[PDB]
Amino acid sequence: RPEIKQAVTVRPGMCGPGSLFVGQLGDWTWETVSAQCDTDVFAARDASGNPTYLAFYYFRVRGGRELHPGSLTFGDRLTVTSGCYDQGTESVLTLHRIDRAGSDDAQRPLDLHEFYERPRDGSLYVENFNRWVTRSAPGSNEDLVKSSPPGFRNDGLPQLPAAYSPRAVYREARTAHTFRALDEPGFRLLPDTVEVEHPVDIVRDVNGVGLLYFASYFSMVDKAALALWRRLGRSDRAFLRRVVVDQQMCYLGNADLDSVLTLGARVRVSTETPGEELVDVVISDRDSGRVIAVSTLHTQH
Amino acid sequence: RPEIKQAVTVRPGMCGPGSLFVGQLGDWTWETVSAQCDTDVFAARDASGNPTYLAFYYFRVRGGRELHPGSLTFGDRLTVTSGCYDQGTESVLTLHRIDRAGSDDAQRPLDLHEFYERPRDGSLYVENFNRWVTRSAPGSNEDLVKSSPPGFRNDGLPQLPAAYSPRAVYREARTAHTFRALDEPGFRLLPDTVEVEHPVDIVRDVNGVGLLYFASYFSMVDKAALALWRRLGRSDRAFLRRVVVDQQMCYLGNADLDSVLTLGARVRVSTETPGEELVDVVISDRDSGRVIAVSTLHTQH
């Protein structure tokens, strides 16, 4: 199955300090899987005709000072290279590489070694690990059930080696509540933390099938990050100047639309590099006793 | 200049109870103008190389019970027909018609009479009246200046007759604070109103060039509408079931990112048709003494 290459002009609907860029990346994942796995992901149903959704489970966006999501402005010309990797019948890994158009070797194919071991400052690397799910009850967003639409073709797809394991990554994050081990050298934990109550926003958090929208988890994480930034006495203009060189998200659950979520955030500062921080955000559903997401942001400010 | 026809599969990034559908419509407007007016709207600059933005000024989405934005779910197949109409060198009108794919006569071209006088229940009609603007000062979002990028080609475009005037429509709305005259028969004004303070949300309201994003005005309007809906003792599930058969928005201004806006809402109920209402929302910037938007929603619930 060939990789998909696209020439993309940055539009208002896919950039800025909100979640529009991650929204576009997720739509590109559903297009890529549809093309490579001979399944209409947008209209997928199981054998009883129940809708099945290719849910986001693990999401990484890795950039750097030379190209990060905040670098993108209206009219920028990009190259996007996308492809899927076999994770069996119930899950699939999609990769996207984003380069500036015309940049040296932008036409190169996907390279696992480049994504997992030698990422280049100037390219953006996206991993989307997705899992097929159905609701266990109409109108309930809890206890989603593993699924696989009939005719889902993972058999074409290239394999990952054992070393490159989005599953090991997300398992450790569910346990540690961070993607960057607390014992990692060269950081100090600030004493300041925040815990923000966030009722589900039924205007802005909800998708076209009545679930919490995967992109709105990035918005909730940034709401927690901004609460912590303000607690540290830092300015709104400075928040809008933050360079996010790496972000990882695990979606442990969805949530009913009447839920009140809790957004917890903490920060580690670099003892090596001024302005470098690791921010961890945990999203909880206290009423059901669930952690529904974990995120780690690596920033320079 | 030919009209642009597209086959569109509804994606998560362009539907649901948020502003993603209007975000997609605006990106389609910038693509359509780029194609028909021989100008890269995404990267437009004036002669001094200052960026110039094709700002949204008047926006209408007209549907009906048979097809409205809330009808759209993942995987729906649509037909989109788009084209521009001459409004001179500083403004341009773009129309989009949206039909279900395969529906009778979905291939028909744009028809002004159909848009302005005989809209069909089952098609969606979009009007975007846009104006070229530059900032009057870097980092300021107030007192935007009229502009026209060099080489903007309106000379190709078809003409509107005098009868069809988005300008008369928006002028009346700026004066009346509604698109549906208060003296219109068959409605009664409820005494219940809301006035909500909304600090600009720098996570969710801001675009890739540091302005308030045109789609986030629709979110702010729905926040006001939901405040009024809750004031009337109505449920969240019922709000998510609302059928918006017509909505009009005028963008009178933008706003600095530290602004605190005021969202005012009022409602008229039908004395003819149960469940039919007209909701008016006014967005104010009290500190600068400006009305920055007016919206009217026609709903069935």
Coordinates of C-alpha atoms in Angstrom, one line a residue:
Chain A
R1 CA 0.0 0.0 0.0
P2 CA 1.7 3.3 -1.0
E3 CA 2.4 6.1 1.5
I4 CA 0.2 9.2 0.9
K5 CA 2.1 12.4 0.0
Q6 CA 0.1 15.7 0.1
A7 CA 1.1 19.4 -0.6
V8 CA -0.8 21.4 2.1
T9 CA -1.2 25.2 2.4
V10 CA -1.8 26.1 6.0
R11 CA -5.4 27.3 6.4
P12 CA -7.0 29.1 9.4
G13 CA -8.9 25.8 10.2
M14 CA -5.6 23.9 11.0
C15 CA -3.3 26.3 13.0
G16 CA -3.1 28.7 15.9
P17 CA -2.9 28.2 19.7
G18 CA -6.0 26.0 19.9
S19 CA -6.6 22.4 18.9
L20 CA -7.2 22.9 15.1
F21 CA -3.8 21.4 14.0
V22 CA -4.3 18.2 16.0
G23 CA -7.9 18.1 14.7
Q24 CA -6.5 18.1 11.1
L25 CA -3.9 15.5 12.0
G26 CA -6.7 13.2 13.2
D27 CA -8.8 13.7 10.1
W28 CA -5.6 12.8 8.0
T29 CA -5.2 9.6 10.1
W30 CA -8.9 8.5 9.3
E31 CA -8.2 9.3 5.6
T32 CA -4.9 7.3 5.6
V33 CA -6.3 4.2 7.3
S34 CA -9.3 4.4 4.9
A35 CA -7.0 4.4 1.9
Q36 CA -4.5 1.7 3.2
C37 CA -7.0 -0.7 5.0
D38 CA -9.9 -0.8 2.4
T39 CA -12.4 0.4 5.0
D40 CA -14.5 3.6 5.1
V41 CA -13.4 4.7 8.6
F42 CA -15.8 7.7 8.5
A43 CA -18.9 5.4 8.1
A44 CA -17.6 2.2 9.7
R45 CA -20.1 -0.3 11.3
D46 CA -19.8 -3.8 12.8
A47 CA -21.8 -6.8 11.6
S48 CA -24.9 -5.9 13.6
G49 CA -24.7 -2.4 11.9
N50 CA -23.6 -0.6 15.1
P51 CA -21.3 2.3 14.4
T52 CA -17.7 1.7 15.2
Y53 CA -15.2 4.5 15.8
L54 CA -11.5 4.5 15.2
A55 CA -10.8 6.1 18.6
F56 CA -7.6 8.0 19.3
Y57 CA -5.6 6.2 22.1
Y58 CA -2.0 7.4 21.9
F59 CA -1.0 10.7 20.2
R60 CA 2.4 12.2 19.8
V61 CA 3.5 15.4 18.1
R62 CA 7.3 15.9 18.1
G63 CA 8.9 19.0 16.6
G64 CA 11.7 21.3 17.7
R65 CA 12.8 25.0 17.7
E66 CA 13.1 25.0 13.8
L67 CA 9.5 23.6 13.2
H68 CA 6.8 23.2 15.9
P69 CA 3.0 23.6 15.7
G70 CA 3.3 27.3 16.8
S71 CA 5.6 27.9 13.7
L72 CA 2.7 27.4 11.4
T73 CA 0.9 30.5 9.9
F74 CA -1.6 31.2 7.2
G75 CA -0.3 30.3 3.7
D76 CA 2.8 28.3 4.8
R77 CA 3.4 25.5 2.2
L78 CA 4.0 22.0 3.8
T79 CA 4.6 18.5 2.5
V80 CA 2.8 15.7 4.5
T81 CA 3.8 12.0 4.2
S82 CA 1.4 9.5 5.8
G83 CA 1.3 5.7 6.3
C84 CA -0.1 2.9 8.5
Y85 CA 1.7 0.2 10.4
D86 CA 0.1 -3.2 11.4
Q87 CA -1.0 -3.4 15.1
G88 CA -3.4 -6.3 14.4
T89 CA -7.2 -6.2 13.7
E90 CA -8.4 -4.0 16.6
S91 CA -5.7 -1.2 16.4
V92 CA -3.6 0.6 13.9
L93 CA -0.6 3.0 14.1
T94 CA -0.6 5.9 11.6
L95 CA 2.5 8.1 11.1
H96 CA 2.6 11.6 9.6
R97 CA 5.8 13.5 8.8
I98 CA 5.4 17.2 8.1
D99 CA 8.2 19.2 6.3
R100 CA 8.3 22.8 4.9
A101 CA 7.7 22.5 1.1
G102 CA 10.9 22.6 -0.9
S103 CA 13.1 21.8 2.1
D104 CA 16.0 19.4 1.4
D105 CA 14.8 15.7 1.1
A106 CA 11.1 16.6 1.9
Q107 CA 10.2 13.8 -0.7
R108 CA 11.9 11.1 1.4
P109 CA 9.5 8.2 2.5
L110 CA 8.6 7.4 6.1
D111 CA 11.6 6.0 8.1
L112 CA 10.8 4.3 11.5
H113 CA 14.4 4.9 12.6
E114 CA 14.1 8.6 11.9
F115 CA 10.7 8.7 13.9
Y116 CA 11.7 6.6 16.9
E117 CA 15.5 7.2 17.2
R118 CA 16.8 10.1 15.1
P119 CA 14.2 12.8 14.7
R120 CA 15.4 15.9 12.8
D121 CA 15.0 19.5 14.1
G122 CA 13.0 21.1 11.2
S123 CA 10.5 18.2 10.7
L124 CA 7.3 17.4 12.6
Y125 CA 6.7 13.8 13.6
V126 CA 3.1 12.6 14.4
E127 CA 2.1 9.2 15.8
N128 CA -1.5 8.2 16.1
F129 CA -2.3 4.8 17.7
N130 CA -6.0 4.2 17.3
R131 CA -8.4 1.5 18.5
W132 CA -11.8 0.5 17.1
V133 CA -14.6 0.9 19.7
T134 CA -18.4 0.7 20.0
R135 CA -20.6 2.1 22.8
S136 CA -21.7 -0.6 25.4
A137 CA -25.1 1.3 25.7
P138 CA -26.7 4.0 23.5
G139 CA -26.0 7.5 24.9
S140 CA -23.3 6.2 27.3
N141 CA -19.7 7.2 26.7
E142 CA -18.3 4.9 29.4
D143 CA -17.1 1.3 29.1
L144 CA -16.5 1.4 25.3
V145 CA -16.1 -2.1 23.8
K146 CA -13.3 -3.2 21.5
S147 CA -14.4 -3.8 17.9
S148 CA -13.1 -4.4 14.4
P149 CA -15.2 -3.5 11.3
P150 CA -15.8 -6.5 8.9
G151 CA -13.2 -6.3 6.1
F152 CA -10.6 -4.2 8.0
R153 CA -7.4 -5.0 6.1
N154 CA -4.3 -4.8 8.3
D155 CA -2.6 -7.7 6.3
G156 CA -1.0 -5.2 3.7
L157 CA 0.6 -3.0 6.3
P158 CA 4.3 -2.8 7.1
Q159 CA 5.5 -4.1 10.5
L160 CA 7.1 -2.3 13.5
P161 CA 10.1 -3.9 15.2
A162 CA 9.7 -4.9 18.8
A163 CA 11.9 -1.8 19.9
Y164 CA 9.2 0.7 18.6
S165 CA 6.2 0.1 20.8
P166 CA 3.5 2.8 21.2
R167 CA 1.9 0.2 23.6
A168 CA 4.8 0.1 26.0
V169 CA 4.8 4.0 25.9
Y170 CA 1.2 4.4 26.8
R171 CA 1.3 1.6 29.5
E172 CA 4.1 3.4 31.3
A173 CA 2.2 6.7 31.1
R174 CA -1.0 5.2 32.7
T175 CA 1.2 4.0 35.6
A176 CA 3.5 7.1 36.1
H177 CA 1.0 9.9 35.1
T178 CA 3.8 11.3 32.9
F179 CA 5.7 10.3 29.6
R180 CA 9.0 11.6 31.1
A181 CA 10.1 9.5 34.1
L182 CA 10.2 11.5 37.4
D183 CA 13.8 10.2 38.0
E184 CA 15.0 11.7 34.6
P185 CA 18.1 13.7 35.5
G186 CA 18.4 17.4 34.9
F187 CA 15.0 18.6 36.1
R188 CA 13.6 19.9 39.4
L189 CA 9.9 19.7 40.3
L190 CA 8.3 23.1 41.2
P191 CA 6.1 23.0 44.3
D192 CA 3.3 24.9 42.5
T193 CA 0.5 22.7 41.1
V194 CA -3.2 23.4 40.0
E195 CA -6.3 21.3 40.1
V196 CA -9.1 22.9 37.9
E197 CA -12.7 21.7 37.8
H198 CA -14.0 21.5 34.2
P199 CA -17.6 20.7 33.4
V200 CA -17.8 19.1 29.9
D201 CA -18.4 22.1 27.5
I202 CA -21.3 20.8 25.4
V203 CA -20.7 23.7 22.9
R204 CA -16.9 23.1 22.4
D205 CA -15.8 19.6 23.7
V206 CA -18.4 17.3 21.9
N207 CA -18.0 15.6 18.5
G208 CA -20.6 14.7 15.7
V209 CA -21.4 11.3 17.4
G210 CA -21.8 12.7 21.0
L211 CA -18.4 11.6 22.4
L212 CA -15.8 13.9 23.9
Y213 CA -13.8 15.0 20.8
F214 CA -10.2 13.8 20.8
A215 CA -8.9 17.4 19.9
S216 CA -10.7 18.9 22.9
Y217 CA -8.5 16.8 25.2
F218 CA -5.6 19.0 23.9
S219 CA -7.7 22.1 24.7
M220 CA -8.4 20.8 28.3
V221 CA -4.7 20.1 28.8
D222 CA -3.7 23.6 27.6
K223 CA -6.4 25.1 30.0
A224 CA -4.7 23.3 32.9
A225 CA -1.2 24.4 31.6
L226 CA -2.5 28.1 31.4
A227 CA -3.9 27.8 35.0
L228 CA -0.4 26.7 36.2
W229 CA 1.3 29.4 34.0
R230 CA -0.9 32.1 35.7
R231 CA -0.3 30.5 39.2
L232 CA 3.5 31.1 38.5
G233 CA 2.8 34.8 37.7
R234 CA 3.6 34.5 34.0
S235 CA 1.9 36.6 31.3
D236 CA -0.7 35.7 28.5
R237 CA 1.6 37.0 25.8
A238 CA 4.4 34.7 27.1
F239 CA 1.9 31.7 27.1
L240 CA 1.2 32.4 23.4
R241 CA 5.0 32.5 22.7
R242 CA 5.6 29.0 24.2
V243 CA 7.4 26.6 22.0
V244 CA 6.1 23.0 22.4
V245 CA 8.8 20.8 21.0
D246 CA 7.1 17.5 22.1
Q247 CA 3.7 16.5 23.4
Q248 CA 2.3 13.0 24.2
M249 CA -1.4 12.2 25.0
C250 CA -3.0 8.9 26.2
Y251 CA -6.8 8.7 26.0
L252 CA -7.7 6.2 28.8
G253 CA -11.4 6.9 28.6
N254 CA -14.2 9.1 27.2
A255 CA -16.9 10.7 29.5
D256 CA -20.6 11.3 29.6
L257 CA -21.6 14.9 28.5
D258 CA -22.8 15.8 32.1
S259 CA -19.5 14.9 33.7
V260 CA -17.4 17.3 35.7
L261 CA -13.7 16.6 35.0
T262 CA -10.7 17.5 37.1
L263 CA -7.5 18.8 35.3
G264 CA -4.4 18.4 37.5
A265 CA -1.0 20.0 36.3
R266 CA 2.6 20.0 37.6
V267 CA 5.8 21.3 36.2
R268 CA 9.5 20.3 36.2
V269 CA 12.1 23.0 35.2
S270 CA 15.5 22.3 33.6
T271 CA 18.6 22.7 35.8
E272 CA 20.7 22.4 32.5
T273 CA 18.8 24.7 30.0
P274 CA 17.1 28.0 31.0
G275 CA 13.3 28.1 29.9
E276 CA 13.0 24.3 29.3
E277 CA 10.1 22.7 31.2
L278 CA 8.1 19.4 31.4
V279 CA 4.4 19.9 32.2
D280 CA 2.3 16.9 33.2
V281 CA -1.5 17.0 33.0
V282 CA -3.9 14.4 34.3
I283 CA -7.6 14.5 33.5
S284 CA -9.8 12.7 36.0
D285 CA -13.5 11.8 36.2
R286 CA -13.9 11.8 40.0
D287 CA -17.6 10.5 39.9
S288 CA -16.5 7.3 38.1
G289 CA -13.1 7.0 39.7
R290 CA -11.3 7.0 36.3
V291 CA -8.2 8.7 35.0
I292 CA -9.4 9.5 31.4
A293 CA -6.2 11.1 30.0
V294 CA -2.5 11.8 30.7
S295 CA -0.4 14.4 28.8
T296 CA 3.3 15.5 28.9
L297 CA 4.4 18.7 27.2
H298 CA 8.1 19.5 26.6
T299 CA 8.4 23.3 26.2
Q300 CA 11.0 26.1 25.7
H301 CA 9.8 29.6 26.8
Chain B
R1 CA -14.4 31.5 -13.8
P2 CA -16.1 28.1 -13.3
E3 CA -17.9 27.3 -10.0
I4 CA -16.1 24.7 -7.8
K5 CA -17.9 21.4 -7.2
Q6 CA -16.5 19.0 -4.5
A7 CA -17.6 15.6 -3.2
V8 CA -17.1 15.8 0.6
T9 CA -17.3 13.0 3.2
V10 CA -18.2 14.5 6.6
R11 CA -15.1 14.2 8.9
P12 CA -14.9 14.7 12.7
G13 CA -13.1 18.0 12.0
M14 CA -16.1 19.6 10.2
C15 CA -19.3 18.7 12.3
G16 CA -20.9 18.4 15.7
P17 CA -22.4 21.0 18.1
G18 CA -19.3 23.2 18.1
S19 CA -17.9 25.6 15.4
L20 CA -16.0 23.1 13.2
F21 CA -18.6 23.1 10.3
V22 CA -18.5 27.0 10.1
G23 CA -14.6 26.7 10.3
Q24 CA -14.7 24.4 7.3
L25 CA -17.0 26.7 5.4
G26 CA -14.7 29.6 5.9
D27 CA -11.6 27.6 4.7
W28 CA -13.7 26.7 1.5
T29 CA -14.4 30.5 1.1
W30 CA -10.7 31.3 1.1
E31 CA -10.0 28.4 -1.4
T32 CA -12.9 29.6 -3.7
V33 CA -11.7 33.2 -3.7
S34 CA -8.1 32.1 -4.3
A35 CA -9.2 30.0 -7.4
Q36 CA -11.6 32.6 -8.9
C37 CA -9.6 35.9 -8.1
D38 CA -6.1 34.7 -9.0
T39 CA -4.8 35.7 -5.5
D40 CA -3.3 33.4 -2.8
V41 CA -5.7 34.5 0.0
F42 CA -3.8 32.3 2.5
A43 CA -0.6 34.3 2.0
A44 CA -1.9 37.7 0.8
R45 CA 0.2 40.9 1.4
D46 CA -0.3 44.5 0.3
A47 CA 2.3 46.5 -1.6
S48 CA 4.5 47.3 1.5
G49 CA 4.4 43.5 2.3
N50 CA 2.0 43.9 5.3
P51 CA -0.2 40.8 5.6
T52 CA -3.8 41.3 4.5
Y53 CA -6.6 39.1 5.7
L54 CA -9.9 38.3 3.9
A55 CA -11.9 38.9 7.1
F56 CA -15.4 37.5 7.6
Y57 CA -18.0 40.3 7.8
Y58 CA -21.4 38.8 7.1
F59 CA -22.1 35.0 7.4
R60 CA -25.3 33.2 6.8
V61 CA -26.1 29.4 7.1
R62 CA -29.7 28.6 6.0
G63 CA -31.0 25.0 6.2
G64 CA -34.3 23.5 7.4
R65 CA -35.7 20.4 9.0
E66 CA -34.6 18.1 6.2
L67 CA -30.9 19.3 6.2
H68 CA -29.3 21.5 8.9
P69 CA -25.8 21.6 10.4
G70 CA -26.9 19.2 13.2
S71 CA -28.0 16.6 10.5
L72 CA -24.4 16.1 9.6
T73 CA -22.7 12.9 11.0
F74 CA -19.4 11.1 10.3
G75 CA -19.3 9.5 6.9
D76 CA -22.2 11.4 5.3
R77 CA -21.6 12.0 1.6
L78 CA -22.2 15.7 0.5
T79 CA -21.9 17.7 -2.8
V80 CA -20.6 21.3 -2.4
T81 CA -20.9 23.9 -5.1
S82 CA -19.0 27.2 -4.5
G83 CA -18.6 30.5 -6.4
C84 CA -17.8 34.2 -5.9
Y85 CA -19.8 37.3 -6.8
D86 CA -18.3 40.8 -7.5
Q87 CA -18.5 43.3 -4.6
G88 CA -15.7 45.5 -5.9
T89 CA -12.0 45.4 -5.0
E90 CA -12.2 45.5 -1.2
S91 CA -14.9 42.9 -0.6
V92 CA -16.2 39.7 -2.2
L93 CA -19.3 37.5 -1.7
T94 CA -18.8 33.7 -1.7
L95 CA -21.8 31.3 -1.9
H96 CA -21.7 27.6 -1.0
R97 CA -24.6 25.2 -1.6
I98 CA -24.5 21.8 0.2
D99 CA -26.7 18.9 -0.8
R100 CA -26.7 15.2 0.2
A101 CA -24.7 13.3 -2.5
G102 CA -27.0 11.6 -5.1
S103 CA -30.0 13.8 -4.2
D104 CA -32.1 14.9 -7.2
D105 CA -30.4 17.8 -9.1
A106 CA -27.4 18.0 -6.7
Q107 CA -25.3 18.8 -9.8
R108 CA -27.3 22.1 -10.5
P109 CA -25.2 25.3 -10.6
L110 CA -25.5 28.2 -8.2
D111 CA -28.8 30.1 -8.6
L112 CA -29.1 33.5 -6.9
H113 CA -32.9 33.3 -7.1
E114 CA -32.8 29.9 -5.2
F115 CA -30.4 31.4 -2.5
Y116 CA -32.2 34.8 -2.0
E117 CA -35.9 34.0 -2.8
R118 CA -36.7 30.3 -3.1
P119 CA -34.4 28.2 -0.8
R120 CA -35.3 24.4 -0.8
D121 CA -35.8 22.4 2.5
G122 CA -33.1 19.7 2.1
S123 CA -30.2 22.0 0.8
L124 CA -27.9 24.1 2.9
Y125 CA -27.2 27.7 1.7
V126 CA -24.1 29.6 2.9
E127 CA -23.2 33.3 2.3
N128 CA -19.8 34.6 3.2
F129 CA -19.3 38.4 2.7
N130 CA -15.6 39.1 3.3
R131 CA -13.5 42.3 3.4
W132 CA -9.7 42.7 3.0
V133 CA -8.2 44.2 6.2
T134 CA -4.7 45.0 7.7
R135 CA -3.8 45.9 11.3
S136 CA -3.5 49.7 12.0
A137 CA -0.7 48.8 14.5
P138 CA 1.3 45.5 15.2
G139 CA -0.3 43.4 18.0
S140 CA -3.5 45.6 17.9
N141 CA -6.8 43.9 16.8
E142 CA -8.8 47.2 16.9
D143 CA -9.3 49.8 14.1
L144 CA -8.5 47.4 11.2
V145 CA -7.9 49.2 7.9
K146 CA -9.5 48.4 4.6
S147 CA -7.1 46.9 2.1
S148 CA -7.0 45.1 -1.3
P149 CA -4.0 42.9 -2.2
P150 CA -2.3 43.9 -5.5
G151 CA -3.6 41.7 -8.4
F152 CA -7.0 40.9 -6.7
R153 CA -9.2 40.0 -9.7
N154 CA -12.9 40.8 -9.1
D155 CA -13.3 41.7 -12.8
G156 CA -14.2 38.0 -13.8
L157 CA -16.9 37.5 -11.3
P158 CA -20.7 37.4 -11.9
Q159 CA -22.8 40.3 -10.6
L160 CA -25.6 40.4 -8.0
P161 CA -28.7 42.4 -8.8
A162 CA -29.6 45.3 -6.6
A163 CA -32.3 43.2 -4.8
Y164 CA -29.7 40.8 -3.3
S165 CA -27.7 42.9 -0.9
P166 CA -25.7 41.4 1.9
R167 CA -24.7 45.1 2.7
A168 CA -28.3 46.2 3.3
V169 CA -28.8 43.1 5.5
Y170 CA -25.8 43.7 7.7
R171 CA -26.4 47.5 8.0
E172 CA -29.9 46.8 9.3
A173 CA -28.5 44.2 11.8
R174 CA -26.0 46.7 13.2
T175 CA -28.9 49.2 13.8
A176 CA -31.5 46.7 15.2
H177 CA -29.3 44.2 17.0
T178 CA -31.2 41.4 15.2
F179 CA -31.6 40.1 11.6
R180 CA -35.4 39.5 12.2
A181 CA -37.3 42.8 12.8
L182 CA -38.8 43.1 16.3
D183 CA -42.1 44.1 14.7
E184 CA -42.2 40.8 12.7
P185 CA -45.7 39.3 13.3
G186 CA -46.2 35.9 15.0
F187 CA -43.6 36.1 17.8
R188 CA -43.6 37.2 21.5
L189 CA -40.5 38.4 23.3
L190 CA -39.9 36.4 26.6
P191 CA -38.9 38.6 29.6
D192 CA -35.9 36.3 30.4
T193 CA -32.5 37.6 29.1
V194 CA -28.8 36.9 30.0
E195 CA -25.7 39.0 30.0
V196 CA -22.5 36.8 30.3
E197 CA -19.0 38.1 30.9
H198 CA -16.5 36.2 28.6
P199 CA -12.8 36.9 28.9
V200 CA -11.2 36.1 25.5
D201 CA -10.1 32.4 25.7
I202 CA -6.5 32.5 24.5
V203 CA -6.5 28.6 24.2
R204 CA -9.7 28.4 22.1
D205 CA -10.8 31.9 20.6
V206 CA -7.5 32.9 18.8
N207 CA -6.3 32.2 15.2
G208 CA -2.9 31.6 13.7
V209 CA -2.3 35.4 13.2
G210 CA -3.4 36.5 16.7
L211 CA -6.9 37.8 15.9
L212 CA -10.2 36.5 17.4
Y213 CA -11.0 33.5 15.0
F214 CA -14.2 34.0 13.0
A215 CA -15.5 30.5 14.0
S216 CA -15.1 31.3 17.8
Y217 CA -17.8 34.0 17.4
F218 CA -20.2 31.2 16.7
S219 CA -19.0 29.4 19.9
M220 CA -19.5 32.6 21.9
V221 CA -23.0 33.0 20.5
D222 CA -23.9 29.4 21.4
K223 CA -22.4 30.0 25.0
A224 CA -24.9 32.9 25.3
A225 CA -27.7 30.8 23.8
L226 CA -26.9 28.0 26.3
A227 CA -26.9 30.5 29.3
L228 CA -30.4 31.6 28.2
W229 CA -31.6 28.0 27.6
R230 CA -30.5 27.1 31.2
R231 CA -32.1 30.3 32.6
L232 CA -35.4 29.0 31.0
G233 CA -35.0 25.6 33.0
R234 CA -34.3 23.6 29.8
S235 CA -32.0 20.6 29.7
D236 CA -28.5 20.0 28.1
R237 CA -29.8 17.0 26.0
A238 CA -32.5 19.3 24.7
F239 CA -29.9 22.0 23.8
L240 CA -28.0 19.3 21.8
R241 CA -31.2 18.4 20.0
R242 CA -31.9 22.0 18.8
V243 CA -32.5 22.4 15.0
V244 CA -31.0 25.6 13.8
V245 CA -32.7 26.3 10.4
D246 CA -31.1 29.7 9.9
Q247 CA -28.3 31.7 11.4
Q248 CA -26.9 35.1 10.5
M249 CA -23.7 36.7 12.0
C250 CA -22.3 40.2 11.5
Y251 CA -18.6 40.8 12.5
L252 CA -18.5 44.5 13.4
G253 CA -15.0 44.3 15.0
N254 CA -12.2 42.0 16.3
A255 CA -10.8 42.4 19.9
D256 CA -7.4 42.5 21.7
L257 CA -6.6 39.1 23.4
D258 CA -6.9 40.7 26.9
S259 CA -10.4 41.9 26.3
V260 CA -13.4 40.9 28.5
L261 CA -16.4 40.6 26.2
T262 CA -20.1 40.7 27.1
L263 CA -22.5 38.3 25.5
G264 CA -26.2 39.4 25.7
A265 CA -29.1 37.1 24.6
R266 CA -32.8 37.4 24.2
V267 CA -35.5 35.2 22.7
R268 CA -38.8 35.5 20.9
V269 CA -41.2 32.4 20.8
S270 CA -43.6 31.7 18.0
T271 CA -47.4 32.3 18.7
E272 CA -48.0 30.2 15.4
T273 CA -45.7 27.2 15.6
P274 CA -44.8 25.4 18.9
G275 CA -41.0 25.1 19.6
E276 CA -40.1 27.8 17.0
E277 CA -37.9 30.6 18.5
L278 CA -35.7 33.5 17.3
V279 CA -32.6 34.1 19.6
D280 CA -30.6 37.3 19.3
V281 CA -27.1 37.6 20.6
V282 CA -25.0 40.8 20.8
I283 CA -21.3 40.6 21.6
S284 CA -19.9 43.9 23.2
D285 CA -16.4 45.1 24.1
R286 CA -17.5 47.4 27.0
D287 CA -13.9 48.9 27.6
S288 CA -13.8 50.2 23.9
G289 CA -17.5 51.0 23.7
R290 CA -18.0 48.7 20.6
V291 CA -20.6 46.2 19.5
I292 CA -18.3 43.6 17.8
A293 CA -20.9 41.1 16.6
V294 CA -24.7 40.5 16.2
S295 CA -26.2 37.1 15.6
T296 CA -29.8 35.8 15.1
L297 CA -30.7 32.1 15.3
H298 CA -33.9 30.7 14.0
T299 CA -34.6 27.4 15.8
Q300 CA -37.1 24.5 16.2
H301 CA -36.9 22.5 19.5

